[PDB]
Amino acid sequence: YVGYLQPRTFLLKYNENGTITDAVDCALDPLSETKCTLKSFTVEKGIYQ
Amino acid sequence: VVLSFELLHAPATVCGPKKSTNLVKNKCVNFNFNGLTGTGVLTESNKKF
Ligand SMILES: *[C@@H]1O[C@H](CO)[C@@H](O)[C@H](O)[C@H]1NC(C)=O
Numbered sequence A: 001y002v003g004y005l006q007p008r009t010f011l012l013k014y015n016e017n018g019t020i021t022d023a024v025d026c027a028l029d030p031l032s033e034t035k036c037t038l039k040s041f042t043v044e045k046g047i048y049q
Numbered sequence B: 001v002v003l004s005f006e007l008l009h010a011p012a013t014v015c016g017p018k019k020s021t022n023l024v025k026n027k028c029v030n031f032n033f034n035g036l037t038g039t040g041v042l043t044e045s046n047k048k049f
Helices: A030-038
Strands: A010-014 A020-025 B031-033 B036-038
Touching: A020 A030
Parallel strands: none
Antiparallel strands: A010 A020, B031 B036
16 A cells, blocks of 8 residues: 655644554544644534634 | 754764763752753653653
């Protein structure tokens, strides 16, 4: 498999071990943009600019 | 001769002459770890690098 890298901004989650467990790609979809804005992988109910 | 000093977050490995001093614990002692300078107490760290 071959893929190509692009300049993007990511939100990476480091656990207590120190390993990157999860990641969010901000520009993928509006939910990911909301997550990157709020700096949390869980977004509560509401409207977010 | 133009000596360009490119510095960034990496092992420098270009460290002009300086001696080493025995490590101390549980005492506020100035530290210079491979160019990272500061003050504080040094303790054995349980985190897994
Ligand atoms: C993460 O740290 C915990 C602490 O006890 C340990 O049990 C666990 O094995 C560690 N995870 C890995 C992948 O080593």
